[PDB]
Amino acid sequence: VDLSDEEKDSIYMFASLVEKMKSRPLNEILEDSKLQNLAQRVFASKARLNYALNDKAQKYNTLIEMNGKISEIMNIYDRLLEQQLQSINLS
Amino acid sequence: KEAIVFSQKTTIDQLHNSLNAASKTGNSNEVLQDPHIGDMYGSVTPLRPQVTRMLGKYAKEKEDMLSLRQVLANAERSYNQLMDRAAN
Numbered sequence: 001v002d003l004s005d006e007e008k009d010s011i012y013m014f015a016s017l018v019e020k021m022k023s024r025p026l027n028e029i030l031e032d033s034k035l036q037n038l039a040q041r042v043f044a045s046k047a048r049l050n051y052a053l054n055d056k057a058q059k060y061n062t063l064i065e066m067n068g069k070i071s072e073i074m075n076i077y078d079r080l081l082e083q084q085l086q087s088i089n090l091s
Numbered sequence: 092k093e094a095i096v097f098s099q100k101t102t103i104d105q106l107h108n109s110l111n112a113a114s115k116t117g118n119s120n121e122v123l124q125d126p127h128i129g130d131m132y133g134s135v136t137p138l139r140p141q142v143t144r145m146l147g148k149y150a151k152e153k154e155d156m157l158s159l160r161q162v163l164a165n166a167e168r169s170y171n172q173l174m175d176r177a178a179n
Contacts, residue, residue: 003156011159015166022169027177039170046163053156060149066100067142069107070135076114077123077132084119 003052007045014042096141099134106131 017038021030030036106128113122122128 003159008159011163011166015162015169018166018169018173022173027173030173031177042163042166049156049160049163053153053160056149056153056156060146060153062097062100063142063146063149066096066103067146069103070139070142073103073107073110073132074136074139076110080110080114080119080123083117084123 001052001055003045003049007041007048010038010042010045014038092141093145096138096145099138102131103135103138106135 017035021035024030109128109131110122113119
C-alpha cells in the first residue's frame with residue numbers, strides 16, 4: 001500500500017549498480033551475490049510498487065471526482081442564491 | 092483522518108444531485124431553504140480544504156511511483172540485456 005524508502009533506495013541502487021556492471025569481464029563475475037540478491041529484492045518490489053502506485057491513482061480520481069461535484073455544488077447554490085437576491089433587489 | 096473525507100463520498104453525491112435537480116427548475120427558494128440541504132452543505136462545504144490537501148498529496152505520490160517505476164523499468168531492461176549475453 002506504500003513503498004518504503006529502503007525499497008525505493010534499492011531501485012536507484014540496483015539501477016546504478018547495473019551500470020557499474022554493464023561491461024565487466026564476465027556475467028558470473030557479477031552473478032556472485034550482491035547483484036543477484038539485490039536484483040531479487042528489486043524485482044519482487046515491482047508488485048508492491050504497482051499495487052502502491054495503483055492505489056495512489058485510484059484515490060486521486062475518487063478525489064478528483066469528489067472535488068468536481070463539490071465545485072458544482074458550491075457553484076449551483078450560488079447561481080441560485082444570486083438570482084434569489086436579485087429578485088428581492090428588483091423590488 | 093483521510094476517512095473523514097472519503098466518508099462524505101455519498102453526502103456529496105446526494106447534495107449534488109438534489110441541488111442539480113433544482114438548477115433546472117428555478118424553484119430557487121425551496122432548495123435554498125430546507126434545513127436538510129443546508130445540513131449537507133454544512134458538512135460538505137468545509138471539506139474543500141482537507142480535500143484540497145489530499146489532492147496535492149496523492150497528486151505527488153502518484154507522480155513519484157510513476158518516476159520510480161520508470162527507473163525500475165529501465166534497470167530491468169539493462170539487467171536483462173546484460174543477462175542475455177549470459178545465455179550463450
